Amino acid sequence: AELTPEVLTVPLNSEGKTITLTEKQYLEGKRLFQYACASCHVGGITKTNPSLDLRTETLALATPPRDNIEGLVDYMKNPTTYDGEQEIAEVHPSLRSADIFPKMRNLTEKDLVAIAGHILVEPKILGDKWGGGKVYY
Amino acid sequence: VSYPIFTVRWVAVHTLAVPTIFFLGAIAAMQFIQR
Amino acid sequence: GTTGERPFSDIITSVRYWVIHSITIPALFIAGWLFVSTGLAYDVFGTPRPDSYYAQEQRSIPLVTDRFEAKQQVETFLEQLK
Amino acid sequence: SANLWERFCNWVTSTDNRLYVGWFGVIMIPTLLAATICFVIAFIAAPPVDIDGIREPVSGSLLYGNNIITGAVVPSSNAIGLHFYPIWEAASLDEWLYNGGPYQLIIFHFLLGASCYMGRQWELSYRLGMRPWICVAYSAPLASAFAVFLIYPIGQGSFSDGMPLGISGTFNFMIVFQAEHNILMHPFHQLGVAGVFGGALFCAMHGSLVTSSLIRETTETESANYGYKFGQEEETYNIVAAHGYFGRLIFQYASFNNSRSLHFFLAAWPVVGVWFTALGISTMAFNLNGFNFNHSVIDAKGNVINTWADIINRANLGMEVMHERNAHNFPLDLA
Amino acid sequence: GWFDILDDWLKRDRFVFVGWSGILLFPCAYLALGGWLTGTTFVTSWYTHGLASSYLEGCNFLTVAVSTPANSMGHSLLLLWGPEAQGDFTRWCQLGGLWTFIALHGAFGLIGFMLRQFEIARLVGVRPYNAIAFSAPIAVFVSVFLIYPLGQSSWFFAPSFGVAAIFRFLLFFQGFHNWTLNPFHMMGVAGVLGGALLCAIHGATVENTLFQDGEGASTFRAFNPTQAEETYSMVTANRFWSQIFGIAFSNKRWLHFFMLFVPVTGLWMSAIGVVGLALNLRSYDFISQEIRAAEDPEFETFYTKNLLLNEGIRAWMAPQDQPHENFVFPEEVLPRGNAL
Amino acid sequence: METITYVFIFACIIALFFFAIFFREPPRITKK
Amino acid sequence: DQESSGFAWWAGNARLINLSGKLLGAHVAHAGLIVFWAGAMTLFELAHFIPEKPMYEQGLILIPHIATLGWGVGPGGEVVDTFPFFVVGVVHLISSAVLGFGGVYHAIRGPETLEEYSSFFGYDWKDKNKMTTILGFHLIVLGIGALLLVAKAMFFGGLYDTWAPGGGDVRVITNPTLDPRVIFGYLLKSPFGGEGWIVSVNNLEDVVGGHIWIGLICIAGGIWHILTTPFGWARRAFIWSGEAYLSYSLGALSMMGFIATCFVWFNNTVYPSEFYGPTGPEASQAQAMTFLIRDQKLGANVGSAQGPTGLGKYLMRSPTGEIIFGGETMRFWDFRGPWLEPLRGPNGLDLNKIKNDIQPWQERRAAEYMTHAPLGSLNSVGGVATEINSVNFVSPRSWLATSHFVLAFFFLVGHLWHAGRARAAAAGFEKGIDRESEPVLSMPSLD
């Protein structure tokens, strides 16, 4: 019962190719997740819009697919609506709006990848907990 | 006065004192365990 | 207002006491420390190590379900690398 | 007449009154009388009150289907919040009783009177040449009423969230409080029960020790109480025999031999403990809640290993999730 | 005779009085406190409650506990050498053997302790009203930690020895027994709360009605340890409360017995209520209320409100609080208000 | 019927309060 | 000099009631502790301070105090230069050494009494002239201090105005409200819902203006006391002793401690939500805003939306008819804030502005404040008691309010304690009832 590199193996892109994170990245991602996400996305939910969570399945049915490092990283730069037919960086933290969301100024591409990996790793560990809310607490 | 050393009070005192410090040392070590 | 025992105040003040207890008190401390740090404690009380609550995949709890064959059932729980 | 007003002041301040109406009494007596009269009438005959301001009246009076245990005086509407709502602020009494008008009239009058009651407990002590601080002990139960009836509503932003005036209603206040604040896991509360448990403990301690060490002056078939006369010179119990016993129960130096050091401790412990429990409610009135150890201890992989703290949280959710059914429209309870 | 010589030694006035009682008290009392402090730091509750309960696992002073045995155990005494543990010590800990250890030992320790009160009092030649009083704490421990679970399915539903583990015991009784609505419990708190009042009010009364027996302001030194005159004005105390409260004591012997009666009687009433909860004979509902609430959907009291809170507590807590039941409650079956 | 019973006992306690305060036994000093 | 034959050890400081010299040392050494904390804590805060991050998310209570005075901040509370924070911190910490020096000096070296080593500084508690005079001195010192604020605001830079026309920014106040009808009007305001008494101040003009009045009035009373003595009634009413004067100031601080608690909890102006957290109501108001904004974007007509109770999911009416936010947030319809006001009309929240004048900066403002409500645990876990560990946060508004209520209360206890003793000390029975002449025994039996 431990955090194996087997668990830290998450899909990198849409074309099946995967990437293996390290215990350093995970922790770093988890920390960065608290720094800039937890505020609204604590435990995989979304306080300011409970209809959309960070479940891998939910990210998969997103448009474009956001259930991989590449999907998530792009989002953190130019976030869109679930159908992708509208850019929402003005009311959502991102690199192209770091002037508006100062927390995103420090964040560099390493940080983005770490954060992305965290979102994909947690449900591997927590399971239904990561997606659901108080019901699973 | 010529007080003795080993007494019933001494026994009582140690039954609590000796394990305590042994526990305080053990717990103190627990503060460094992780994952 | 007095009994046979040697007044604490005198003993806690006596140099002889500290000559003794500067050795004894830290000794017990280091011993208790070793008791945990060497992982012995884990085995004396069957307490699970951070990597010994579940199996890798399993997410179920090793709940004891019958009194008489409990000990045997517990041992079986340790089998699945738990 | 030596001077009407001069006589008046002499009558008020008079220590020859059956009940000492003090200067604080001049405020207490009317206020306490208004509070009690309104309460009694309300508790019996008041119509249902829309406490949560959601047009969902809660009946808490006897004549409207309640008994002693369930009956209560329902807090003012959540539509009023912290607004001042006297009778002359309503188009009619019908409206006034619907929006929980009586409640404010009672709590304000009570808290006012109960404060002057503390003020009077000094005055009489002053008039009788005895030391003060008796009122200081009463400051503890008063500060709780204040925390429960005034401080928490102020903090939460509505008098509708103040503790109701009733048995079961008091139970609701607690259960919900536990949900929103996790009070059992708060140091100030824990100090409160400690003072309260310790209090009852020490009350039994002192009580027993003294009554057990009484000097014999009574017959075998005569009340042991008669062995005391009101206005004695000497003591009625052997405090030296008391100390001898209790000193052997534990050990000598862990026993009192000074009656004055004894009674101070008897007074200090519960008062201080309740003082913190009152500060607890007053602190959690600004949402500085108890310890949150939810999902603290986790295993090497990241799995959540539950504690009793987690089992507590499950009970708490149930309270949270079910309380005020139809009052919430949005995800977070920030009110 | 060796007996009277054995007696001689035991009843010798030491720093820590032993006595005949001590032969029972000290062994149990120590093992009970020791067993707790042991389990508190080392032994787990994983195989029994699916819980971490020790410092070794990461619990703190509040969340640590010596949890009850499994529900499988039933009311088994769980002897170290019993059919369950089979002499094994490690297994014994994991099956929650330390709970029945602490319980039974502590039980006899409370027996030994009251006996100590009885024995010492006899020697000192004082009345045993300290032993009579200590009966209330006995009744509570007996009713709660023994009688109650003896009425339930197993020791599992007894209060586990620990801070937080007791808090759940409170919430449980609320959710499941509606314990606050019980007349016997109410008498309980009235005694404790009323007892904590007597404690406060009497001490303060005394400290502020004292005579001047010294020239210093710190009047503590000015007390005569060798009886004589009353250190405080009972007569002044009387007239005070008679004018501020209307009623006042005037018989120290009654005042102090009253201080014994109130908190002892309360604890005893609360015991009886718990004895009734063992068979689940609770004070859960008011039939007249429910009948109207059923026919009339607009009838609402603070009583009805509370029951809904109970429904939530039961539903959301039962799964992880009663593992042995393998409870599975779908999200849709979970009772919930709006939004929350 | 229930309402009456509740108020009755209550009214009785208040009545007792009165007598307890103003019709007590006069607390006499020394020579008692 | 002083030992057990005066007071007990645990009442040690009461042995200094009549030792002017040493009693001055205490006050000078004590005042150093206050300056020391202020200094050492500011540097502690700065040392942890993260510029590109909200102050309320960093456990700051001193740097946001400096920020309000227009220092190191700019547009929208953006931190520009951390040097002023560093300065305020270090200067204090230095001054603590100077004060601490004198304190220690007067307490163990200098004259144990002052009366002889200087009749000007020496004093007598019962000397109604010296007391009113020393009081007169401090009444001026505080008066100038009140003007020190007025100066910083009108001349030396200004203050942080959240109500800034172009959006929260440091603004120089050059038009202080000096109209007495307006200023002292606040004192005649109710302390309940709506009419908020002193805490209801909502613009820097009044703040600066009011301080001008206080500054002058204080010094005016400062001079008055120098050149006078207490009247007749003033003497026949009060108790004149060292403890009595203490009690009077104790209840005074208690009252101010309670007023400060409500100020940091309710007021938006002198406690900017940009530096501190959002106020309690502000946070609950934001959630209604947020989800009114969301659902409306989903095509919902918020104006006519009917909630479970049939009251109005998003918008409803106040008891006086004003259009307000719906839900449990109906209790906070008294909230006013820069982000929300442009949506308000003459009858409350305007359905047309709500329908198409919602600005993006407002949406994310609502989301921010919504997700930063002053809800948390003692171990600092942001959210409801049932929340999960992740977000380590507790609103500064929560820390300050709770801390200062505890202090204010205990000071009310201290007041009663020292006021009760002074009355008994004066009349002379604070040490017990006279065994011989027992007062009660001379009064008729009420029986």
Ligand code: CLA
């Ligand atoms: C006098 C003090 C005292 C008392 C009353 C108890 C009481 C108890 N202990 Mg205990 N204990 C003590 C001191 C004491 N302990 C000390 C000092 C230690 C440290 C070594 C322990 C260590 C300890 C452990 C490790 C355990 C207990 C347990 C128990 C419980 C069950 C034991 C049992 O079955 O008794 C048996 C009773 C007797 C043996 C009394 C027999 C007396 C008769 C007169 C003698 C006859 C013998 C003769 C051969 C019979 C012939 C008959 C013929 C037909 C064969 C019981 C509540 C168990 C427990 O709590 O389970 C949950 C447990 O596992 N104790």
Ligand code: CLA
């Ligand atoms: C302006 C504030 C002020 C001032 C100048 C005084 C001054 C005085 N008080 Mg006093 N008092 C105050 C506020 C104040 N008080 C308040 C607010 C209360 C309410 C609690 C009291 C309650 C009080 C009592 C009950 C008594 C005094 C007494 C006295 C006199 C002797 C001083 C003494 O006993 O020191 C001795 C100081 C101590 C023993 C220190 C106590 C430590 C406190 C209780 C703990 C604080 C907790 C701390 C924050 C936690 C730190 C963590 C720790 C691990 C480091 C002296 C004239 C005594 C006297 O003679 O009356 C005239 C006396 O009996 N006061």
Ligand code: CLA
């Ligand atoms: C704000 C805290 C404070 C302050 C300023 C004082 C101040 C004072 N107390 Mg005091 N006291 C306090 C808290 C405080 N107390 C508390 C909490 C208690 C309860 C435990 C007491 C109990 C108490 C008793 C029982 C007595 C005093 C007395 C005194 C006075 C004489 C001090 C003395 O005997 O020197 C002795 C000095 C020393 C033994 C050396 C101490 C070292 C110095 C003072 C500290 C150095 C500070 C710093 C590290 C150096 C900086 C140097 C730098 C500037 C260069 C003095 C005015 C006495 C009195 O009445 O005066 C006649 C007295 O009898 N106090």
Ligand code: CLA
């Ligand atoms: C009273 C004003 C006050 C306020 C509002 C704050 C507020 C804050 N401080 Mg702070 N602080 C203060 C005074 C204050 N402090 C003082 C006087 C000191 C000097 C010791 C410090 C030293 C300090 C440090 C070193 C740090 C803070 C930090 C913080 C922040 C995090 C709070 C936290 O986690 O504390 C939680 C604290 C507790 C839960 C302890 C509560 C203790 C209570 C009051 C004890 C009560 C028991 C009672 C007195 C017993 C007596 C009874 C007996 C007589 C019978 C917060 C903004 C931290 C920070 O900025 O990081 C973000 C940080 O690292 N503060």
Ligand code: CLA
């Ligand atoms: C609460 C403040 C305070 C008060 C009332 C006193 C009072 C006193 N001190 Mg003293 N002192 C203090 C703080 C204080 N000190 C501090 C902080 C220190 C550390 C540096 C000292 C160090 C000190 C020493 C070393 C000595 C005294 C002495 C004395 C006594 C003789 C008067 C004197 O020296 O003034 C003479 C000086 C003046 C009258 C003029 C001083 C004016 C200064 C330079 C300007 C101050 C500006 C001020 C901060 C702003 C106010 C202006 C504002 C209204 C606009 C007198 C009782 C002496 C003593 O014990 O003799 C009995 C002595 O030898 N003090």
Ligand code: CLA
């Ligand atoms: C904090 C600073 C301070 C202090 C401690 C004092 C202290 C004193 N002043 Mg004073 N004064 C001050 C500042 C201060 N002054 C200032 C700044 C001015 C200029 C305006 C004056 C002008 C002044 C005059 C003209 C007189 C005094 C007098 C007095 C003495 C008697 C006060 C009295 O009996 O009031 C007791 C008050 C009452 C009996 C009235 C109670 C009714 C109050 C005001 C309303 C209820 C309060 C309520 C709870 C608070 C709510 C707020 C309200 C706005 C709603 C006393 C020594 C008198 C004296 O003896 O002259 C030397 C006197 O005639 N003062």
Ligand SMILES: CC1=C(/C=C/C(C)=C/C=C/C(C)=C/C=C/C=C(C)/C=C/C=C(C)/C=C/C2=C(C)CCCC2(C)C)C(C)(C)CCC1
């Ligand atoms: C089980 C068992 C047993 C037993 C054993 C024992 C008996 C042990 C003991 C043990 C012990 C005997 C331990 C102890 C411990 C203790 C501790 C661990 C403590 C701690 C403490 C602390 C931590 C403190 C704290 C505090 C307080 C509380 C006060 C205030 C302040 C302070 C903080 C200081 C036997 C073998 C017989 C058999 C088998 C079973």
Ligand SMILES: CC1=C(/C=C/C(C)=C/C=C/C(C)=C/C=C/C=C(C)/C=C/C=C(C)/C=C/C2=C(C)CCCC2(C)C)C(C)(C)CCC1
């Ligand atoms: C507007 C404003 C302002 C201002 C304010 C002011 C101006 C205030 C004032 C205030 C005041 C001006 C107050 C006063 C107070 C008073 C008092 C508090 C008093 C008290 C008194 C007493 C307490 C007394 C008592 C008594 C009696 C009555 C009888 C006889 C005896 C005795 C003495 C006990 C500010 C700045 C904030 C800001 C802006 C806004």
Ligand SMILES: CC1=C(\C=C/C(C)=C/C=C/C(C)=C/C=C/C=C(C)/C=C/C=C(C)/C=C/C2=C(C)CCCC2(C)C)C(C)(C)CCC1
């Ligand atoms: C009387 C008395 C007392 C009290 C005392 C006191 C209260 C004292 C105070 C003292 C004080 C009040 C002190 C102060 C100090 C301060 C200082 C000494 C300062 C320092 C500074 C510096 C050193 C600088 C600089 C810096 C910076 C700028 C940054 C970097 C870091 C540093 C920090 C280096 C007692 C209770 C004990 C006992 C009895 C007697």
